[PDB]
């Protein structure tokens, strides 16, 4: 088989890159390990940046998002008996964020790729990458027991944290930066109306809680849990009693509860590799970096890596400027590290940590009181939360 | 002996409280352990907030400060080969800071107290405080071997970190918050012209450096040093070679060096006690709290504790409103904890720490790049650095 760009991974990064590229006339094949149905079972993200909303419109896949996505103009933080609204729109200079589930975005891209007839191979087993510093890279994989070869000019590793393409770079050429946090998030999806029209992040003595949503009749809630926990110990009953105990009383009284559609625990991690490319392999999304879910930045950083890679591959194919591709990692990493610092900051001030002496507990509380009480403080949260601007380039 | 307010400590907190009170007609005695000359040997602070400048004018002791103090409109931070100016005046809404040495402020207050004839007992040995929850507190002390008693209505503990008055409160009534940092500052005073017209804080791989001043012909420099260091291992020569190595090359080339007038190491500490009062004893200044020198807040928090105590003692004596004194600690601690959080933040992003994994090193660098590159980021530094407004009260 032969193509121009081989994309490893059919989650949101690989599908959005594939759609952008197809629309500009650049042929591409996506290889995915799993089935369509397994990819669509993953709940994950709910919050999209405007930058991400504009990229879906650029890829022509925004009809359902513009109908069904909810635009949010603000977010609440609750701490020490008080609730504080951050007017994102006012403080960021008119930007907002959009709530539309990752499942939905992925289904829309999948429906779009299928219609235009572009290649996607699902159940592609044992993907291997070869001759990365050559002129002619190739990918081998197995389909129904026979080993096939796909020849390409470039490879985009969009295969998430446990994918083959970061593992295919000589470990000595990579610098890893990682922090593992001593807690996870227990998340619960329920077909119930959300308890507020905006998000509520809560710092409570028992641990963090977050109230979020998917639509007017579907809700998504999170509580901080130790790493030792397993989801079979948390009945629906136990989760709603614990959520209610971590919220302000006038918010817990209004809570409509109900059976879970989905329940799961996600560990919190920060992870960055430098560089994000090797020869003709370019990493994008969770393959190159992980942020804790607290700043809602993972899928949105995937969007700007993909946006930066699409514009540089377009310069390389339409305009013959293949040299501009060496700049991919420097351009992406400026943005990645600022969103990593915001996600770390949010995580630090909203969660209950283990080694906590009396001084750090009080500095944590005073960080919330300063940033939420000052107009300049509020603006640093708001501009980071809506998403810092993408780099123009050339 | 009998007085209205007994003040333990003749450093800047006790002298400024004493002057304010004398000027409003409220009699007061200051007791100091040391001699005038020992108190005047301490170099310490160089940066005063406007709030502090206005309080010295209110106490009538500002003639030399208005002549000789330098008003600064901005400050520089240097990190990773670049220098960034924070325009304090622009970003704080017109506030500036004033550079006038602590030695000078203290001499001016001392000269003022002497002239007006108010009581000061120096070499007051073994000060003890008695009957703190009574109607009639008293202080005993020794002068030339004989033990004398001073009767008073109130006692102000302005005796710094190692003073008797925090030790005189039942330990069970106090909550202590403390962080000890794994480094100190080696400071050097030299009769040389400053290397810049504004302050330069420098984060360097070898450790922190700070370029500061006392006048057009006197300079004060600091380098971060391990706690194991002793000042006799640091010759003038060794200090200037190390200062130069931590600065941008175009700043080290312009440096005029010279012999030290004073050299000393100061350990970095954060410390807060809650409450700041017990019965008829009120703590003020370093007796109640310590901040690391990095945000220039210690003497300025002493000024606002004293300002808050003077206005409440005035309501108690002129207006009979002695009940308003129970509010002293709650009013002071709102301000103390925000300046403690700023001083901790400055310390964290400007110094080289020991346990430093690759992720934290990069978050430290990204904090500097975000706060210094964003207008909202720059405004949070600038409003904290000029001093957050004092509480109005009643
Ligand atoms: C609890 C939670 C909440 C989050 N909330 C948000 C939020 O609100 N906002 C936000 O911006 N981000 C959020 N995120 C992050 C976001 O979901 C991810 O960053 C996003 O899924 C990244 O997409 P991706 O395509 O890079 O990776 P993935 O979604 O992981 O997809 C990669 C694909 O590659 C496939 N693959 C893996 N290995 C191979 C292989 N060897 N061969 C072939 N295919 C392979 C996988 O099967 C997978 O389909 C959240 C994450 C979690 C877990
Ligand atoms: C290196 C350094 C740099 C600094 N830079 C700045 C800066 O630029 N800006 C800023 O705002 N702050 C800065 N500070 C902090 C500032 O110097 C202090 O917060 C300030 O000295 C507090 O004044 P005070 O009167 O409360 O205490 P002190 O100055 O400590 O004086 C207390 C007095 O009480 C006396 N005393 C103690 N025990 C007894 C007793 N038992 N009986 C009687 N008398 C007693 C002592 O002899 C002393 O004279 C700096 C400090 C250091 C060390």
Swiss-Prot record, chains A, B:
Q: Which pathway does this polypeptide act in?
A: Aromatic compound metabolism; benzoate degradation via hydroxylation; 3,4-dihydroxybenzoate from benzoate: step 2/2
Q: Which residues bind FAD?
A: 13, 32, 42-47, 102, 286, 299-300
Does this entry carry the keyword NADP? yes
Q: Which InterPro entries match?
A: FAD-bd (IPR002938), FAD/NAD-bd_sf (IPR036188), HB_mOase (IPR012733), RIFMO-like (IPR050641)
How is its cofactor bound, per UniProt? Binds 1 FAD per subunit.
Q: Where is this site: Important for catalytic activity?
A: 201, 385
The enzyme's E.C. designation: 1.14.13.2
Q: Pfam families annotated for this entry?
A: FAD_binding_3
Is Lipoprotein given among the entry's keywords?
no
Q: Name one GO molecular function term.
A: 4-hydroxybenzoate 3-monooxygenase activity
Look up the record and name the cofactor or cofactors this protein needs: FAD
Q: Which reaction does it catalyse?
A: 4-hydroxybenzoate + NADPH + O2 + H(+) = 3,4-dihydroxybenzoate + NADP(+) + H2O
Its function? Catalyzes the incorporation of an atom of dioxygen into p-hydroxybenzoate (p-OHB) to form 3,4-dihydroxybenzoate (3,4DOHB). The reaction occurs in two parts: reduction of the flavin adenine dinucleotide (FAD) in the enzyme by reduced nicotinamide adenine dinucleotide phosphate (NADPH) in response to binding p-hydroxybenzoate to the enzyme and oxidation of reduced FAD with oxygen to form a hydroperoxide, which then oxygenates p-hydroxybenzoate.
What further note is attached to this protein's record?
Answer: Controlled catalysis is achieved by movement of the flavin and protein between three conformations: in, out and open. The open conformation is important for substrate binding and product release, the in conformation for reaction with oxygen and hydroxylation, and the out conformation for the reduction of FAD by NADPH.
Family to which the UniProt record says this protein belongs: Belongs to the aromatic-ring hydroxylase family.
Q: Kindly state the subunit structure of this protein.
A: Homodimer.
Protein name in UniProt: p-hydroxybenzoate hydroxylase
- Species source reads Pseudomonas aeruginosa (strain ATCC 15692 / DSM 22644 / CIP 104116 / JCM 14847 / LMG 12228 / 1C / PRS 101 / PAO1)
Q: Which gene encodes it?
A: pobA
